[PDB]
Scaffold this active site. Structure first.
Site, PDB file in Angstrom:
ATOM      1  N   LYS A  54       0.834  -1.234   0.000  1.00  0.00           N
ATOM      2  CA  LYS A  54       0.000   0.000   0.000  1.00  0.00           C
ATOM      3  C   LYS A  54       0.859   1.272   0.000  1.00  0.00           C
ATOM      4  O   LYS A  54       0.355   2.334  -0.444  1.00  0.00           O
ATOM      5  CB  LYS A  54      -1.004  -0.070   1.148  1.00  0.00           C
ATOM      6  CG  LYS A  54      -2.013   1.071   1.064  1.00  0.00           C
ATOM      7  CD  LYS A  54      -3.124   1.019   2.053  1.00  0.00           C
ATOM      8  CE  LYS A  54      -4.169   2.072   1.755  1.00  0.00           C
ATOM      9  NZ  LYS A  54      -3.561   3.319   1.227  1.00  0.00           N
ATOM     10  N   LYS A  66      -6.410  -7.708  -0.981  1.00  0.00           N
ATOM     11  CA  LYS A  66      -6.241  -8.924  -1.834  1.00  0.00           C
ATOM     12  C   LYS A  66      -4.862  -9.492  -1.520  1.00  0.00           C
ATOM     13  O   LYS A  66      -4.694 -10.757  -1.516  1.00  0.00           O
ATOM     14  CB  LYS A  66      -6.493  -8.605  -3.320  1.00  0.00           C
ATOM     15  CG  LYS A  66      -8.024  -8.402  -3.546  1.00  0.00           C
ATOM     16  CD  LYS A  66      -8.372  -7.928  -4.974  1.00  0.00           C
ATOM     17  CE  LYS A  66      -9.840  -8.264  -5.308  1.00  0.00           C
ATOM     18  NZ  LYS A  66     -10.657  -7.338  -4.485  1.00  0.00           N
ATOM     19  N   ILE A 100     -11.966  -9.012 -31.754  1.00  0.00           N
ATOM     20  CA  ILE A 100     -13.014  -9.408 -30.749  1.00  0.00           C
ATOM     21  C   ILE A 100     -12.677  -8.702 -29.444  1.00  0.00           C
ATOM     22  O   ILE A 100     -11.702  -9.069 -28.805  1.00  0.00           O
ATOM     23  CB  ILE A 100     -13.126 -10.931 -30.567  1.00  0.00           C
ATOM     24  CG1 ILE A 100     -13.424 -11.666 -31.877  1.00  0.00           C
ATOM     25  CG2 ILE A 100     -14.169 -11.261 -29.507  1.00  0.00           C
ATOM     26  CD1 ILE A 100     -13.591 -13.174 -31.703  1.00  0.00           C
ATOM     27  N   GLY A 183       6.099  -6.553 -29.976  1.00  0.00           N
ATOM     28  CA  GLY A 183       4.733  -7.081 -30.144  1.00  0.00           C
ATOM     29  C   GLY A 183       4.257  -6.897 -31.571  1.00  0.00           C
ATOM     30  O   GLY A 183       3.459  -7.716 -32.079  1.00  0.00           O
TER      31      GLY A 183
END
Ligand SMILES: *CC[C@H](OP(*)(=O)O)[C@H](O)COP(=O)(O)O
Ligand code: NA
Ligand code: NA
Length: 324
Positions: A54, A66, A100, A183
């Site tokens: 944090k 979490k 998509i 990429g």
DNA sequence: CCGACGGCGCATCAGC
DNA sequence: GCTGATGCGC
DNA sequence: GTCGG
């Protein structure tokens, strides 16, 4: 830092990010979880508590809680429940197909189309982009080694100049920053006949199709081409993967600002814009403009090189390879 | 407490 | 036929 | 989901 440090945490946060983007359609949570994953991936200590995490910017109360659950249990109940939902799994999977997104994935799963095989059986329900994304599903998930990017750059730069010796082309993205892998290939193109004040892309795409470098088109307009390319292999040899190439035609007077913008990194560009502001200039994708004493942007300044931008704001030139 | 969080260029749909 | 919104990728 | 006015 070794992935074994915080890899459990960063994998959990990447899984949540992908769920928020693809299933929840919550792009701002996706980006919050990615930002948290990135800051934690850079942290040179094995996180022992949520409270420790944090302290890092982009980690707040919910990601701390979490991390406390993951550290105590080795799992997150929220993800275990998501992984049991076949519908969430299918929606998430279909978004791996270029074209998509979250909407199309949900429409497909709601009409019982859930797998690559389902998509192949239903090509009439796919748009042109999605058909090509399906055709190259595996190749599009492969990285491009720098050595192949150098070969691609040599074909693109040389074939552009055969169309017209006055074109200027620059490969930007990770490659320009000196990455060992890419990429995709992002090419910025300009020509002195094209300015912000008055067939150029069509003829370049046509030449790259004629020498069988560009193999397919995802989209094409007057200023942006998105498509597919492949390095030539010698006869009888193993074929190279199909690759994503974008080509952006930019006005000559905006060209070096574009090169700076599409080179990045994101953090570099953010730090550069902030530096410009305190120096009395504003930089965007297109222009550098002086700011008057009440914050009014003046006329775009002439930019004949990337270095021109750094000179205006009195920064020493960062080599493209020193911007990540 | 609540809005920002990048936003452009292209394909495609909704609505007229 | 057109305009404007939305989805999409980067 | 986190940040900051
Ligand atoms: C992960 C905790 C969540 O953070 P965000 O506002 O997505 C919420 O506090 C609770 O969400 P749940 O996990 O759906 O209950
Ligand atoms: Na924090
Ligand atoms: Na996709």
């Amino acid at each position: 830092p070794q992935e074994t440090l915080n890899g459990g945490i960063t994998d959990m946060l990447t899984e949540l990010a992908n769920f928020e983007k693809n299933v929840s359609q919550a792009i701002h949570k996706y980006n919050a979880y990615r930002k948290a994953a990135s800051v934690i991936a850079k942290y040179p200590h094995k996180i022992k508590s949520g409270a420790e995490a944090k302290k890092l910017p982009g980690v707040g109360t919910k990601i701390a809680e979490k991390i406390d659950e993951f550290l105590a249990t080795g799992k997150l109940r929220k993800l275990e429940k998501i992984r049991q939902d076949d519908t969430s799994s299918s929606i998430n999977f279909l978004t791996r197909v270029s074209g998509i997104g979250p909407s199309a994935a949900r429409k497909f799963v709601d009409e019982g189309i859930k797998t690559l095989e389902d998509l192949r059986k239903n090509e009439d329900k796919l748009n042109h982009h999605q058909r090509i994304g399906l055709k190259y599903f595996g190749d599009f998930e492969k990285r491009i080694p720098r050595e192949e990017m150098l070969q691609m750059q040599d074909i693109v730069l040389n074939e552009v100049k055969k169309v017209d010796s006055e074109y200027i082309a620059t490969v930007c993205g990770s490659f320009r920053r000196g990455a060992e892998s890419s990429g995709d290939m992002d090419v910025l193109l300009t020509h002195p006949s094209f300015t912000s004040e008055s067939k150029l892309l069509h003829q370049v795409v046509e030449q790259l199709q004629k020498v069988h470098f560009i193999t397919d088109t995802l989209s094409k307009g007057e200023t942006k081409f998105m498509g597919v390319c492949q390095l030539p292999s010698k006869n009888d040899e193993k074929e190279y993967p199909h690759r994503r190439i974008d080509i952006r035609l930019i006005p000559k007077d905006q060209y070096y600002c574009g090169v700076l913008y599409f080179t990045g990194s994101d953090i570099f560009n953010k730090n550069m814009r902030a530096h410009a502001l305190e120096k009395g200039f504003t930089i965007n994708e297109y222009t550098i403009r002086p700011l008057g004493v009440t914050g009014v942007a003046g006329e775009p300044l002439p930019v004949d090189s990337e270095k021109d931008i750094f000179d205006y704001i009195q920064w020493k030139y960062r080599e493209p390879k020193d911007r990540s």
